[PDB]
């Protein structure tokens, strides 16, 4: 049904499966193959939740989170980071870089959704 | 031997590189498992082959660790036979066009000698050597360009075949040019901190070639791309 | 010096230990995909969950490689909390009952101390260490016994807490019974060559322990079994 | 066709999936958790095909192999070896030690059968 989600990942295989789980709960989703695309797609509308991963080619997840947290409309839109980097420093570099939740990869889709639910229902 | 600082980061690379496919496997499997209601046969089978394809990625990465060990033990052999090199490279080309497209890469096989080309080497290990440079060609390329290819050129040279692997991609600095063939080496740059890379591909390739009593070497500058030459004598001795 | 000969074997071991579950994963996936008609709901879910379980094993193994780097890079944390060491054992004992049973291993937790035990340590990281030995306790046992168990004895001593992990499996030749703690070290044996292992487990364990300002040592003989003592100051000085 | 298969593997999980694939074809299977069991399940009857792996606790599959090629009755019962040791001398060692065929793990169940078939219609 209602809530939108911007899903940003240089991975197609991963976008598919994250998307499948999202729409299974009603949400609609807009993909973003990278950081540039992510923001280009963003000047157009405002997602109610964002799913961002870190390592990608044109512009990375770190810079993306940055531009988010330095702008008034964007500051407030919650972000779940999905990264393969577990190193608990990376997590702080992410929360301090704006993120509202960090989730390690590999991840449980059910948990992930369980997280995506709470963040849409604060 | 700074080999002990390098194998330390080679450890974290094995980590990162294996957990990408493992992330697909878990996510897809848990999904199928939890969403039989909301899957149609066509998606089911699709998710199942995702699991299968990611497994095979993971199997190849494990094969690399294996090969390497068998090499750094001086304990691996070649079994040479009469191979039509022209097919072997194309069978190889055909074996990449997936990866190729996933990165918007055209794959080219050119011939400068006539194409029934005969050879006395091991098709398996050479097919492997091909796939190694081909891959790296796709894997290392212009992050945004329409022009991009990977070009395999067959040739004979000095009573011995000369295969070249040209890319139009991202290329390599001089200081690194000689150290790219070692165990564990990876060209670190803010440009490509992203690439899954083991740092063993070329180490396994050099070794495999230098057992056919041949050589591998490189030309490149930081803008045009890169050339890989594998000189391999028609029949060794 | 030697570290390079050992890492060359540590490679062949990442290889072997990662392809066990990968073999389960690839086989079950392919079968599901190839047998959706011959597959009854019950069986599909069973095979699906095998795939899931097998990835969770594979994930843990990868976690070790991650932990390790973060240690041999002296770059690892520790976040202390009020933990009831009494439950932190069983909450971690039951987590083993599966692996245990499939090896014919009974698992016991005894105490010589009042059992609302308080401790200011890292619950997640101690858990992991607990698991390392409980695991080796199972992973290593007399290959045919009804008698066999892995026992955790929790105890307060010297103003610190002393946890000990006893086994009626085998032990270790003295020539190595403190060589077993360094990273990459495994015990080679014609009795114990089929076991999957990295040789990081115990080195991860040590580091975690030594960072809690504690220590770990071993006492064993070639038939009775083994004991691991982990001394931990109940609250840091 | 109505042929028996003896399945030797210390892997419960792997026995289950080989067995499944085997029965999908008709063949019946007698399981065996190690080398010792493998033989005290063999004085009982003669299988038309044996499926064997290398690593296991009580007794390894290299011995088991040795013993099949030093009996008259057993000599002719074709063995497929399934090992994680793909090192192409581990295969030589296996063939010389008696086995008619070696398959590397991970294996494709379909090929495995395709191979198992080929030996059953010898
Ligand atoms: N075609 C190429 N273009 C640019 N760089 C390359 C190429 N091939 C190899 N390299 C460099 O060599 C390093 C490691 O070589 P190799 O072992 O084959 O790669 P991998 O990291 O995929 O294992 C990489 O980090 C990369 O910088
Ligand atoms: N409870 C035990 N009984 C006998 N041997 C043990 C025990 N625990 C550890 N070891 C020995 O210590 C070595 C390495 O320890 P660890 O790093 O935990 O093992 P691995 O990574 O191989 O599981 C093993 O190869 C084994 O020989």
XYZ file of C-alpha atoms and ligand atoms in Angstrom:
772
model
C 0.000 0.000 0.000
C 1.276 3.283 1.338
C 4.876 3.884 2.564
C 7.707 4.359 0.042
C 11.315 3.114 0.320
C 14.418 4.182 -1.551
C 16.722 1.219 -1.878
C 20.324 1.926 -2.793
C 22.693 -0.881 -3.710
C 25.202 -1.574 -6.444
C 23.883 -5.137 -6.261
C 21.010 -6.278 -8.472
C 20.716 -9.720 -6.818
C 20.602 -7.999 -3.498
C 18.178 -5.287 -4.628
C 15.768 -7.914 -5.890
C 15.599 -9.878 -2.629
C 15.452 -6.760 -0.423
C 12.742 -5.379 -2.699
C 10.749 -8.645 -2.666
C 10.568 -8.504 1.128
C 9.663 -4.842 1.212
C 6.694 -5.120 -1.228
C 5.517 -8.233 0.635
C 4.623 -5.732 3.379
C 2.906 -3.291 1.004
C 5.640 -0.658 0.621
C 6.685 0.518 -2.801
C 10.336 0.841 -3.687
C 12.610 2.873 -5.885
C 15.979 1.431 -6.800
C 19.237 3.299 -7.009
C 22.195 1.400 -8.543
C 24.611 3.896 -6.856
C 25.196 7.094 -4.911
C 24.773 9.485 -7.810
C 21.601 7.789 -8.987
C 20.437 7.723 -5.372
C 20.406 11.512 -5.034
C 19.242 12.196 -8.611
C 16.207 9.972 -7.850
C 15.872 11.980 -4.633
C 15.573 15.550 -5.897
C 12.357 14.137 -7.413
C 10.553 12.834 -4.319
C 11.058 12.129 -0.614
C 11.177 8.490 0.622
C 9.757 7.652 4.039
C 12.636 5.211 4.615
C 16.003 4.662 2.934
C 18.047 1.477 2.689
C 21.700 2.151 2.004
C 24.722 -0.065 1.568
C 28.374 1.103 1.703
C 30.823 -0.129 -0.954
C 29.876 1.107 -4.446
C 31.649 2.495 -7.582
C 30.520 5.989 -8.742
C 29.926 7.401 -5.304
C 29.936 5.391 -2.086
C 27.517 4.953 0.832
C 29.601 7.099 3.164
C 29.367 10.241 1.082
C 25.632 9.539 0.520
C 24.803 9.438 4.242
C 26.805 12.649 4.554
C 24.773 14.744 2.106
C 21.670 13.360 3.779
C 22.495 14.602 7.300
C 23.465 18.105 6.024
C 20.093 19.202 4.621
C 16.822 19.973 6.434
C 14.302 17.749 4.605
C 16.769 14.859 4.425
C 18.167 15.074 7.981
C 14.893 13.578 9.276
C 14.357 10.641 6.893
C 15.604 7.492 8.690
C 18.253 5.312 7.122
C 19.026 1.641 7.595
C 22.555 0.901 6.513
C 23.132 -2.634 5.241
C 26.866 -3.342 5.145
C 29.214 -6.357 4.848
C 31.695 -4.469 6.985
C 30.967 -5.641 10.511
C 33.991 -3.910 12.068
C 32.102 -2.124 14.891
C 34.009 1.070 14.040
C 32.317 1.140 10.598
C 29.041 1.102 12.570
C 29.990 4.232 14.535
C 31.342 5.914 11.392
C 27.851 5.267 10.104
C 25.682 6.355 13.019
C 27.813 9.425 13.514
C 27.540 9.884 9.765
C 23.751 10.158 10.126
C 22.480 6.554 10.027
C 19.597 5.549 12.298
C 20.337 1.793 12.297
C 23.228 -0.394 11.135
C 22.553 -3.952 9.938
C 25.368 -6.464 9.218
C 25.446 -8.571 6.070
C 24.642 -11.458 5.750
C 21.288 -10.455 7.347
C 17.955 -12.085 8.183
C 15.285 -10.764 5.877
C 12.734 -11.191 8.620
C 14.784 -9.230 11.137
C 15.551 -6.631 8.481
C 11.869 -6.069 7.821
C 11.242 -6.138 11.576
C 13.640 -3.216 11.688
C 12.170 -1.499 8.642
C 8.749 -1.718 10.328
C 9.750 -0.025 13.588
C 11.462 2.818 11.693
C 8.280 3.530 9.734
C 6.178 3.305 12.875
C 7.962 5.586 15.339
C 59.158 -10.464 5.178
C 56.302 -7.908 5.100
C 54.343 -10.930 3.817
C 52.948 -10.953 7.378
C 51.248 -7.536 7.131
C 49.868 -8.430 3.707
C 48.450 -11.883 4.632
C 46.785 -10.016 7.531
C 44.726 -7.879 5.148
C 44.399 -10.822 2.738
C 42.489 -12.292 5.661
C 39.906 -9.498 5.670
C 39.569 -9.778 1.898
C 38.757 -13.480 2.027
C 36.186 -12.290 4.572
C 34.561 -9.584 2.473
C 34.690 -11.506 -0.778
C 33.051 -14.635 0.485
C 30.247 -12.930 2.330
C 28.780 -11.196 -0.688
C 27.474 -14.470 -2.187
C 26.818 -15.818 1.282
C 24.579 -12.769 1.817
C 22.580 -13.693 -1.290
C 22.278 -17.378 -0.247
C 20.971 -16.608 3.208
C 18.587 -13.876 2.088
C 17.154 -15.842 -0.770
C 16.827 -19.050 1.244
C 15.172 -17.449 4.214
C 12.811 -15.685 1.809
C 11.720 -18.799 -0.061
C 11.352 -20.486 3.282
C 9.178 -17.709 4.678
C 7.291 -16.755 1.506
C 5.963 -19.894 -0.212
C 2.548 -18.219 0.007
C 3.746 -15.156 -1.889
C 5.974 -16.785 -4.494
C 4.904 -17.868 -7.960
C 6.594 -20.833 -9.575
C 8.584 -18.524 -11.820
C 9.991 -16.469 -8.996
C 10.630 -19.607 -6.872
C 12.772 -21.204 -9.487
C 14.504 -17.845 -10.013
C 15.355 -17.419 -6.330
C 16.521 -21.020 -6.274
C 18.963 -20.350 -9.111
C 20.139 -17.236 -7.390
C 21.178 -19.567 -4.545
C 22.766 -21.892 -7.051
C 24.721 -19.163 -8.885
C 25.957 -17.562 -5.745
C 27.096 -21.032 -4.522
C 29.141 -21.436 -7.713
C 30.715 -18.030 -7.177
C 31.631 -19.163 -3.698
C 33.017 -22.477 -5.065
C 35.305 -20.630 -7.444
C 36.663 -18.491 -4.700
C 37.395 -21.547 -2.686
C 39.075 -23.132 -5.711
C 41.423 -20.150 -5.728
C 42.599 -20.743 -2.195
C 43.081 -24.352 -3.165
C 45.030 -23.731 -6.329
C 47.183 -21.241 -4.512
C 48.108 -23.634 -1.736
C 48.991 -26.261 -4.366
C 51.290 -23.646 -5.897
C 52.982 -22.174 -2.826
C 53.830 -25.772 -2.080
C 55.443 -26.288 -5.497
C 53.010 -29.186 -5.682
C 50.810 -28.767 -8.792
C 51.092 -30.261 -12.289
C 50.237 -29.607 -15.936
C 48.777 -32.233 -18.294
C 49.367 -30.929 -21.866
C 47.394 -31.923 -25.009
C 46.651 -30.814 -28.596
C 44.217 -27.937 -28.119
C 42.846 -25.598 -30.749
C 43.721 -22.378 -28.921
C 41.162 -20.471 -31.073
C 38.241 -22.443 -29.581
C 39.663 -22.433 -26.065
C 39.721 -18.622 -25.919
C 36.212 -18.377 -27.391
C 34.821 -21.127 -25.131
C 36.409 -18.840 -22.532
C 34.868 -15.659 -24.019
C 31.463 -17.317 -24.009
C 32.153 -18.106 -20.362
C 32.212 -14.440 -19.316
C 29.499 -12.694 -21.297
C 27.357 -12.919 -18.134
C 29.843 -11.057 -15.928
C 30.620 -8.925 -19.000
C 27.054 -7.579 -19.281
C 26.647 -7.113 -15.501
C 29.226 -4.361 -15.969
C 28.176 -3.310 -19.469
C 31.254 -4.856 -21.136
C 31.619 -6.046 -24.725
C 33.867 -9.112 -25.187
C 36.207 -9.393 -28.177
C 38.325 -12.156 -29.708
C 40.594 -11.018 -32.538
C 42.947 -13.198 -34.616
C 46.294 -12.192 -36.158
C 47.361 -15.741 -37.080
C 45.016 -18.112 -39.015
C 42.393 -19.808 -36.820
C 42.784 -23.499 -36.593
C 45.637 -22.742 -34.100
C 47.068 -25.906 -32.490
C 48.746 -26.006 -29.065
C 50.488 -28.333 -26.616
C 49.419 -27.120 -23.162
C 46.755 -27.958 -20.563
C 43.374 -26.599 -21.744
C 41.990 -26.539 -18.192
C 44.741 -24.437 -16.645
C 45.057 -22.149 -19.656
C 41.246 -21.716 -19.769
C 41.707 -20.762 -16.135
C 44.515 -18.350 -17.005
C 42.307 -16.791 -19.675
C 39.354 -16.451 -17.310
C 41.687 -14.789 -14.876
C 42.741 -11.903 -17.140
C 39.283 -11.699 -18.806
C 37.614 -11.324 -15.415
C 40.120 -8.713 -14.213
C 39.440 -6.891 -17.464
C 35.736 -6.729 -16.751
C 36.229 -6.290 -12.953
C 38.759 -3.493 -13.623
C 37.344 -1.045 -16.138
C 36.082 2.509 -16.669
C 33.471 3.174 -13.951
C 31.507 5.214 -16.493
C 32.192 4.727 -20.202
C 30.270 3.441 -23.265
C 33.422 2.424 -25.198
C 34.437 -0.458 -22.941
C 35.671 -3.873 -24.082
C 38.101 -6.641 -23.203
C 40.147 -7.828 -26.146
C 41.811 -11.226 -26.520
C 44.352 -11.326 -29.332
C 45.882 -14.620 -30.383
C 49.301 -14.656 -32.146
C 52.407 -16.762 -32.841
C 55.774 -15.291 -31.827
C 59.237 -16.843 -31.524
C 58.040 -20.399 -32.201
C 55.511 -19.916 -29.431
C 52.012 -18.532 -29.017
C 51.465 -14.984 -27.786
C 48.082 -14.279 -26.198
C 47.306 -10.662 -25.258
C 44.502 -9.475 -23.003
C 43.715 -5.853 -23.809
C 41.293 -3.690 -21.890
C 40.263 -0.071 -22.439
C 39.700 0.133 -18.662
C 41.330 1.721 -15.636
C 45.069 0.742 -15.827
C 48.039 0.537 -13.420
C 50.779 2.793 -11.908
C 54.441 2.043 -12.593
C 55.647 1.344 -9.021
C 53.047 -1.465 -8.836
C 53.635 -2.826 -12.355
C 56.095 -5.506 -11.168
C 54.444 -6.273 -7.811
C 50.999 -7.157 -9.216
C 52.027 -10.786 -9.799
C 52.977 -11.609 -6.203
C 50.965 -13.500 -3.612
C 48.344 -11.258 -2.036
C 49.024 -7.994 -3.883
C 46.215 -5.538 -4.586
C 46.485 -2.070 -6.149
C 44.876 0.061 -3.452
C 43.430 3.391 -4.643
C 40.466 5.520 -3.579
C 39.290 4.732 -7.142
C 38.910 0.976 -6.478
C 38.568 0.182 -2.764
C 35.326 -1.550 -3.892
C 36.557 -4.574 -5.889
C 35.900 -7.984 -4.196
C 39.414 -9.202 -5.196
C 41.445 -11.964 -3.505
C 44.874 -10.729 -4.581
C 45.721 -14.259 -5.755
C 44.447 -14.414 -9.362
C 47.654 -13.185 -11.002
C 49.903 -15.022 -8.560
C 48.113 -18.230 -9.643
C 48.374 -17.140 -13.279
C 52.074 -16.312 -13.297
C 52.844 -19.601 -11.578
C 50.676 -21.630 -14.017
C 52.363 -19.953 -16.992
C 55.912 -20.248 -15.631
C 55.282 -23.998 -15.326
C 54.464 -24.201 -19.042
C 57.914 -22.657 -19.347
C 56.372 -19.350 -20.399
C 55.989 -15.810 -19.014
C 53.394 -13.201 -18.162
C 54.101 -9.439 -18.159
C 52.329 -6.051 -18.343
C 52.011 -2.647 -20.026
C 49.657 0.137 -18.845
C 49.254 3.784 -17.952
C 46.589 5.205 -15.588
C 44.162 6.283 -18.338
C 44.135 4.033 -21.386
C 43.928 0.604 -19.811
C 46.178 -2.437 -19.749
C 47.886 -5.122 -21.807
C 48.656 -8.687 -20.610
C 51.085 -10.814 -22.521
C 51.324 -14.538 -21.993
C 54.226 -15.971 -23.963
C 53.973 -19.748 -24.270
C 56.210 -21.909 -26.517
C 54.367 -24.034 -29.123
C 55.797 -27.200 -27.498
C 57.991 -26.602 -24.387
C 60.841 -29.069 -23.495
C 60.102 -17.517 9.780
C 57.771 -20.565 10.038
C 54.577 -18.439 10.006
C 54.763 -18.438 6.189
C 54.745 -22.283 6.025
C 51.804 -22.345 8.419
C 49.747 -19.667 6.642
C 50.267 -21.741 3.464
C 48.427 -24.484 5.349
C 45.971 -22.107 6.988
C 44.881 -21.400 3.390
C 44.259 -25.043 2.483
C 42.157 -25.093 5.663
C 39.817 -22.156 4.939
C 39.353 -24.052 1.706
C 38.441 -27.358 3.323
C 36.311 -26.057 6.124
C 34.234 -23.748 3.937
C 33.398 -26.341 1.317
C 31.635 -28.690 3.695
C 28.535 -26.511 4.100
C 28.902 -25.156 0.605
C 28.505 -28.760 -0.549
C 25.311 -29.141 1.450
C 24.028 -25.781 0.129
C 24.765 -26.468 -3.509
C 23.326 -30.009 -3.387
C 20.080 -29.141 -1.612
C 19.435 -26.040 -3.726
C 20.010 -27.981 -6.943
C 17.775 -30.778 -5.754
C 14.902 -28.473 -4.798
C 15.214 -26.756 -8.116
C 15.350 -30.041 -9.920
C 12.647 -31.838 -7.917
C 9.804 -29.395 -7.184
C 7.417 -32.073 -8.550
C 8.827 -34.946 -6.453
C 9.009 -32.658 -3.419
C 6.400 -32.707 -0.676
C 5.843 -29.549 1.291
C 7.466 -31.095 4.397
C 10.581 -32.113 2.520
C 10.952 -28.711 0.780
C 10.978 -26.852 4.035
C 13.397 -29.337 5.517
C 15.792 -28.912 2.595
C 15.279 -25.114 2.712
C 16.224 -25.020 6.347
C 19.234 -27.216 5.757
C 20.392 -24.522 3.314
C 19.763 -21.862 5.938
C 21.621 -23.808 8.684
C 24.487 -24.547 6.422
C 24.883 -20.796 5.614
C 24.819 -19.961 9.273
C 27.741 -22.332 9.770
C 29.496 -20.798 6.798
C 28.773 -17.307 8.260
C 30.347 -18.213 11.619
C 33.435 -19.472 9.928
C 33.690 -16.216 8.047
C 33.120 -14.360 11.326
C 36.281 -15.961 12.700
C 38.330 -14.608 9.822
C 36.864 -11.196 10.539
C 37.411 -11.286 14.325
C 40.936 -12.448 13.719
C 41.997 -9.576 11.480
C 40.478 -7.129 13.982
C 42.775 -8.718 16.601
C 46.024 -9.057 14.704
C 45.372 -5.419 13.831
C 45.210 -4.659 17.581
C 41.963 -2.931 16.621
C 39.241 -4.694 18.630
C 36.847 -3.420 21.322
C 35.221 -4.714 24.544
C 32.029 -3.364 26.138
C 31.548 -4.446 29.733
C 28.185 -5.023 31.467
C 26.495 -6.657 34.504
C 26.265 -10.303 33.445
C 24.999 -13.288 35.446
C 27.812 -15.659 34.511
C 25.557 -18.557 35.652
C 23.150 -18.107 32.707
C 25.758 -16.793 30.256
C 26.987 -20.379 30.373
C 23.711 -22.301 29.742
C 22.379 -19.674 27.320
C 25.630 -20.761 25.628
C 25.464 -24.419 26.613
C 22.088 -25.087 24.963
C 23.402 -23.237 21.895
C 25.704 -26.250 21.611
C 23.326 -29.119 22.424
C 22.666 -29.611 18.671
C 26.302 -29.858 17.546
C 26.898 -31.829 20.736
C 24.232 -34.501 20.255
C 25.176 -35.145 16.607
C 28.559 -36.170 17.959
C 27.228 -38.181 20.910
C 28.293 -35.475 23.373
C 26.499 -34.762 26.660
C 27.002 -31.245 27.992
C 27.266 -30.249 31.653
C 27.528 -27.077 33.719
C 28.602 -27.339 37.370
C 29.265 -24.704 40.028
C 31.319 -24.512 43.222
C 29.846 -21.031 43.781
C 26.427 -19.391 44.619
C 24.452 -19.235 41.392
C 23.339 -15.677 40.890
C 27.005 -14.990 39.821
C 27.733 -11.323 38.966
C 30.456 -10.217 36.526
C 31.578 -6.959 34.877
C 32.803 -8.261 31.502
C 31.731 -8.334 27.803
C 28.797 -10.779 27.479
C 28.951 -11.122 23.686
C 32.707 -11.609 23.583
C 32.890 -13.976 26.602
C 30.025 -15.983 25.034
C 32.146 -16.410 21.926
C 35.124 -17.639 24.020
C 32.955 -19.953 26.007
C 31.760 -21.295 22.670
C 35.286 -21.691 21.312
C 36.200 -24.345 23.927
C 32.820 -26.033 24.339
C 33.154 -26.451 20.596
C 36.674 -27.888 20.728
C 35.399 -30.001 23.618
C 32.932 -31.560 21.204
C 34.956 -31.212 17.991
C 37.663 -33.047 19.923
C 36.572 -36.186 21.731
C 37.171 -39.900 22.067
C 35.830 -41.149 18.704
C 33.759 -43.908 20.379
C 32.360 -43.452 23.913
C 29.038 -43.308 25.817
C 30.873 -41.622 28.667
C 31.809 -38.447 26.817
C 30.921 -34.883 27.783
C 32.218 -31.296 27.860
C 31.985 -29.718 31.272
C 32.054 -26.092 32.290
C 32.980 -25.462 35.868
C 32.451 -21.900 36.989
C 34.413 -20.695 40.060
C 35.515 -17.578 41.966
C 39.250 -17.498 42.837
C 41.816 -14.775 43.645
C 39.239 -11.950 43.620
C 38.582 -12.986 40.022
C 36.313 -15.522 38.325
C 37.740 -18.786 37.037
C 35.842 -20.634 34.332
C 37.181 -24.035 33.338
C 36.241 -26.268 30.358
C 36.876 -29.971 30.995
C 36.752 -32.782 28.423
C 36.951 -36.603 28.460
C 37.936 -36.465 24.822
C 41.649 -36.554 24.037
C 44.464 -34.191 25.054
C 47.673 -32.853 23.538
C 51.325 -33.975 23.387
C 53.243 -31.721 25.798
C 55.593 -30.592 22.973
C 52.724 -28.341 21.805
C 50.428 -27.863 24.862
C 51.216 -24.118 24.810
C 52.020 -23.931 21.126
C 48.247 -24.497 20.651
C 47.433 -20.875 21.559
C 49.189 -18.989 18.773
C 47.339 -17.952 15.604
C 47.243 -20.634 12.895
C 48.384 -23.429 15.190
C 46.626 -26.783 14.925
C 47.625 -30.236 16.210
C 48.486 -32.606 13.342
C 47.644 -36.257 14.087
C 46.711 -39.439 12.221
C 43.932 -39.612 14.838
C 42.888 -36.011 14.081
C 43.277 -35.058 10.423
C 39.549 -35.264 9.431
C 38.535 -32.416 11.755
C 37.747 -29.031 10.214
C 39.764 -26.185 11.733
C 41.469 -22.850 11.186
C 43.863 -22.582 14.073
C 42.459 -19.149 14.926
C 39.787 -20.238 17.376
C 42.082 -20.430 20.425
C 44.122 -17.324 19.418
C 40.902 -15.364 19.158
C 40.047 -16.827 22.584
C 43.376 -15.816 24.130
C 43.247 -12.269 22.829
C 39.704 -11.709 24.071
C 40.732 -13.094 27.449
C 44.031 -11.191 27.710
C 42.130 -8.007 26.857
C 39.809 -8.660 29.803
C 43.120 -8.590 31.719
C 42.844 -12.356 32.245
C 44.642 -15.480 31.037
C 44.045 -18.938 29.686
C 46.126 -22.054 30.083
C 45.819 -25.793 29.449
C 46.488 -29.039 31.235
C 46.142 -32.324 29.301
C 47.473 -35.854 28.689
C 47.165 -38.088 25.595
C 44.075 -40.034 26.765
C 42.368 -38.621 29.848
C 41.252 -35.388 28.189
C 41.808 -31.657 28.609
C 41.196 -28.656 30.839
C 41.052 -24.964 29.904
C 41.171 -22.475 32.694
C 40.198 -18.894 31.968
C 41.003 -16.482 34.736
C 39.019 -13.279 34.749
C 38.987 -10.378 37.240
C 35.318 -10.068 38.314
C 35.738 -6.251 37.978
C 38.691 -4.447 36.285
C 41.376 -2.694 38.392
C 16.015 -49.895 -12.374
C 15.846 -52.016 -9.181
C 19.511 -51.777 -8.031
C 20.833 -51.355 -4.468
C 23.241 -48.614 -3.431
C 25.421 -48.514 -0.353
C 26.068 -44.992 0.784
C 29.124 -44.375 2.859
C 29.414 -40.930 4.424
C 29.920 -39.585 7.917
C 27.646 -36.693 6.877
C 24.038 -37.074 7.990
C 23.131 -33.974 5.931
C 24.924 -35.280 2.886
C 23.611 -38.798 3.190
C 20.076 -37.364 3.228
C 20.535 -35.533 -0.061
C 22.383 -38.253 -1.896
C 19.810 -40.757 -0.660
C 16.939 -38.503 -1.876
C 18.483 -38.164 -5.293
C 19.189 -41.913 -5.424
C 15.611 -42.961 -4.471
C 14.325 -40.394 -7.015
C 15.469 -43.013 -9.536
C 14.244 -46.164 -7.833
C 17.523 -47.385 -6.337
C 17.439 -48.500 -2.700
C 20.163 -47.373 -0.339
C 21.787 -48.693 2.793
C 23.449 -45.956 4.848
C 26.789 -46.172 6.677
C 28.182 -43.575 9.107
C 31.847 -44.746 8.683
C 34.337 -47.306 7.340
C 33.798 -49.831 10.136
C 30.006 -49.713 9.741
C 30.517 -49.733 5.973
C 31.939 -53.247 6.260
C 29.732 -54.747 8.996
C 26.904 -53.693 6.677
C 28.627 -55.555 3.830
C 29.089 -59.052 5.240
C 25.281 -58.885 5.079
C 24.809 -58.427 1.283
C 26.415 -57.231 -1.975
C 25.427 -53.759 -3.339
C 25.326 -53.026 -7.068
C 27.110 -49.704 -6.499
C 28.956 -48.017 -3.618
C 29.111 -44.272 -2.904
C 32.059 -43.370 -0.695
C 33.706 -40.269 0.733
C 37.261 -39.885 2.108
C 37.339 -38.182 5.554
C 35.682 -39.923 8.556
C 36.185 -40.668 12.358
C 36.522 -44.407 13.127
C 38.136 -45.462 9.861
C 38.824 -43.516 6.663
C 37.586 -44.260 3.142
C 41.085 -44.816 1.748
C 41.243 -48.023 3.754
C 37.680 -49.019 2.876
C 38.719 -48.622 -0.762
C 41.811 -50.772 -0.268
C 39.703 -53.630 1.140
C 37.209 -53.715 -1.750
C 40.001 -54.248 -4.300
C 41.552 -57.155 -2.297
C 38.450 -59.341 -2.275
C 37.089 -61.293 -5.269
C 33.354 -60.605 -4.738
C 33.918 -56.933 -3.957
C 36.584 -56.215 -6.601
C 33.864 -55.823 -9.264
C 31.384 -53.599 -7.364
C 31.972 -50.121 -8.817
C 32.729 -47.293 -6.412
C 32.049 -43.629 -6.827
C 34.168 -41.563 -4.563
C 32.854 -38.184 -3.503
C 35.599 -36.167 -1.913
C 36.260 -32.536 -0.916
C 39.853 -33.267 -1.871
C 39.871 -32.189 -5.512
C 43.694 -32.136 -5.728
C 44.160 -34.203 -8.877
C 46.574 -36.704 -7.217
C 44.074 -37.453 -4.447
C 42.087 -38.718 -7.461
C 44.941 -40.820 -8.806
C 45.402 -42.209 -5.278
C 41.682 -43.072 -5.298
C 41.552 -44.800 -8.697
C 44.661 -46.864 -8.028
C 43.198 -47.701 -4.610
C 40.305 -49.220 -6.566
C 37.565 -46.657 -7.229
C 35.973 -46.670 -10.667
C 35.200 -42.921 -10.507
C 36.036 -39.799 -8.507
C 33.701 -36.814 -7.994
C 34.801 -33.527 -6.490
C 32.733 -31.809 -3.788
C 30.778 -29.597 -4.142
C 29.093 -31.785 -6.743
C 26.046 -31.352 -8.932
C 23.422 -33.918 -7.887
C 22.311 -34.239 -11.465
C 25.809 -35.154 -12.774
C 26.262 -37.431 -9.833
C 23.222 -39.420 -10.866
C 24.213 -39.091 -14.556
C 27.410 -40.755 -13.503
C 25.763 -43.236 -11.137
C 23.493 -44.168 -14.043
C 26.449 -44.719 -16.382
C 28.013 -47.201 -13.938
C 24.750 -48.996 -13.272
C 24.259 -49.609 -17.001
C 27.849 -50.866 -17.383
N 43.151 -5.503 -15.957
C 43.515 -4.817 -14.829
N 43.357 -3.473 -14.712
C 43.727 -2.795 -13.591
N 44.273 -3.364 -12.489
C 44.477 -4.717 -12.473
C 44.100 -5.524 -13.661
N 44.408 -6.801 -13.376
C 44.938 -6.820 -12.115
N 44.975 -5.583 -11.583
C 45.520 -5.222 -10.253
O 46.171 -6.341 -9.647
C 45.763 -6.518 -8.292
C 45.628 -8.014 -8.005
O 45.753 -8.871 -9.163
P 44.866 -10.241 -9.218
O 45.507 -11.154 -8.204
O 44.685 -10.813 -10.607
O 43.445 -9.561 -8.833
P 42.381 -9.875 -7.663
O 42.431 -8.737 -6.666
O 41.129 -9.954 -8.537
O 42.805 -11.188 -7.044
C 44.457 -5.739 -8.159
O 44.257 -5.098 -6.889
C 44.451 -4.727 -9.308
O 44.777 -3.367 -8.959
N 39.651 -29.747 23.946
C 40.699 -30.085 23.140
N 41.207 -31.346 23.095
C 42.254 -31.674 22.286
N 42.871 -30.800 21.456
C 42.447 -29.498 21.408
C 41.319 -29.069 22.261
N 41.109 -27.770 22.020
C 42.027 -27.386 21.094
N 42.813 -28.416 20.729
C 43.931 -28.331 19.774
O 44.234 -26.948 19.533
C 44.392 -26.717 18.122
C 43.942 -25.315 17.716
O 42.976 -24.751 18.632
P 41.754 -23.913 17.982
O 42.468 -22.717 17.432
O 40.608 -23.723 18.950
O 41.397 -25.115 16.945
P 40.748 -25.149 15.468
O 40.787 -23.723 14.945
O 41.558 -26.110 14.615
O 39.398 -25.705 15.879
C 43.603 -27.820 17.435
O 44.152 -28.175 16.157
C 43.623 -28.976 18.438
O 44.665 -29.926 18.171
